[PDB]
């Protein structure tokens, strides 16, 4: 038992963590078979950042003028093309420690871990969320950029997230490994500012589920609620609306305890509109939004009786 | 900037993990060299649980009775020893994987990384800290026992922690890799119970540092304190005592933030009586512990390991 913020195990992603230099611009690169993945941004200057032609940089640029670096051994480009904010460098050599991998593009809510690097060398592994503003809520210093996120779903790495920028307030933008933004951010030097933050809902319900489990069920109550009632007192608290989906991704819980997601709902909006009289649940004083249903259940492991 | 909760990368620890199966009982061991280390209740049952002999049970198994598996590849094992609570099984094979290791026994307050493991296989990582009482607040279920718990330092892995077992409460006792417990307990069924858990102030003390660094400095008041002064209000709200060791340790974070640690103090001193009416330090509304000094300067400082 106990309950937990876990990231993924990180091995499989060191593995492919790179180095790559343009000019005086280093950053991290991920290196899967004989492609080098980095934010397009390594080819600028910070004089360019501030209205920056990418197209013309890139045709400036020959293979020759991207040094990789994987630990001592330099790996020779052989290509380079730029798809959306990424840049793609075709080397000689295929990573031998290449995982089994897909790339995908996560929602708002959704978790993972992220490695952050300096230099093509991990310094740390936490647990972040994909924030309802495209936000991310981490700990990146200069050199982090191309630092990723990433789930483990069987053996298989899926890539969701590559470090871009941080925004005034100190949380993080980035792209999918397409090199699509998360958010309505680019990777210019112009004033940009996150929008609005709401709370992740379905999030704030399985850690109430999670707190259950662990013994805490002070505040719940024998009132239930309908839908479109709780996303309108949620909408009220800066709160993600609750869709048919996020209700279906509870179902499991809902199970476990015999808690209905409405009845769970209920108990919500009696918390938002009443407060928490200082009371900790899991020994938190604020509702936490960053773990997943899944992150729940895996940690519980508890039965159904059916 | 950002301040998460970071565990080190996991890679040097995952190429480590093994199962151990010895009759119907299967565990985690950690393979370096050629030994592998795991908690010697491996070689119990259920049935012995109550109150083993564990030199008599060990005395009447040979190297056969032990199936230590490295994925697909099946480990023998040439040698068996017990030290202290850890059975040592030597193999025919050296890790390849070894890393730069050492052993270390931590002190109380002291945090570390565990790499949760099932069957050999590595499942998640998360910090924690050795709590005063020589618990750690962890999450395990049954299949857990002989994960491990990391610092690294350079490019060396310092092993101090394996995990044997689960207290009443809900929290976790184990070895160091020399297999002596942390805290008076032991590998038998017993009434067992955690003492008195308190606060690790030198690890607060760390985190505000880390909330300045990062521009979260609204609880920073003009008034100093004595060293005796903070402690005789420190302990009524169930703080360990500060020390001049402390105060030293300290010293780093002072120097770099241009804080002196008793004007620190006198800011922790004013959060204790009147609380944070309403307001967060790097969005958390409760004091933090499970980050050292070192801690908060590894994580501002970008450090990498091999």
Same mark, same amino acid.
């Given at each position: ?5 876990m990231?993924?195990?990180s091995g499989?992603?060191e593995?492919?963590? !790179?180095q ?6 280093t ?13 397009r941004?390594?080819?600028? @200057? ?11 940089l890139?045709?400036r640029?020959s ?11 330099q ?10 904010c990424?840049?793609?460098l ?8 290449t995982?089994k ?12 871990? !992220?490695?952050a690097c300096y230099?093509?060398?991990?310094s740390?592994?936490?647990?972040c969320?994909m ?16 630092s ?22 100190g949380?993080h ?8 933004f998360?958010?309505?951010f ?6 940009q500012?996150?929008?609005?933050? @709401?709370?992740?809902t379905?999030?704030?319900?399985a ?10 069920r002070?505040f719940l109550?024998?009132? @239930?609620? @309908? ?9 009220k608290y800066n709160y993600e609306?609750?869709?048919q ?15 209905a997601?409405?009845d ?5 909006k ?5 407060g ?21 259940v895996?940690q ?7």
């Open positions: 038992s106990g309950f937990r913020k990231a993924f195990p499989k992603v593995g492919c963590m !790179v790559v230099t343009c000019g005086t611009t950053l991290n690169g991920l290196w899967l078979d004989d492609v080098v993945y980095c934010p941004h390594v080819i600028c @200057t910070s004089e360019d950042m501030l209205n920056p032609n990418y197209e013309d890139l045709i640029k293979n020759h003028n991207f040094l990789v670096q994987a630990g001592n051994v790996l020779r480009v052989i290509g380079h093309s730029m798809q959306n990424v840049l793609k075709k080397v000689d050599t295929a990573n031998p420690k995982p991998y897909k790339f995908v593009r996560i929602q708002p809510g959704q978790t993972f871990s !992220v490695l230099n093509g060398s991990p740390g592994v936490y647990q969320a924030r309802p503003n495209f936000t991310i809520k981490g700990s990146f210093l200069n050199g982090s950029c191309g990723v996120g990433f789930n483990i779903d069987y053996d298989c790495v899926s890539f969701c997230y590559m470090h871009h920028m941080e925004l005034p307030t949380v933008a980035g792209t999918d490994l397409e090199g699509n998360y958010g309505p680019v990777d210019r030097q112009t004033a500012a996150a929008g609005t933050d @709401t709370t992740i379905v999030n704030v319900l850690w109430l589920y999670a707190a259950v489990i662990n013994g805490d002070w109550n024998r009132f @239930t609620t @309908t839908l479109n009632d709780f996303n309108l007192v949620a909408m609306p609750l869709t989906d996020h209700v279906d991704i509870l179902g499991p819980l809902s199970a476990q305890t015999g808690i997601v409405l769970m709902c209920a108990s919500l009696e918390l938002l509109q009443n928490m009289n200082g009371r900790t649940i899991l020994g938190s004083a604020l509702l936490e939004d960053e773990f997943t249903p899944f992150d729940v895996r519980c492991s508890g039965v159904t009786f059916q």
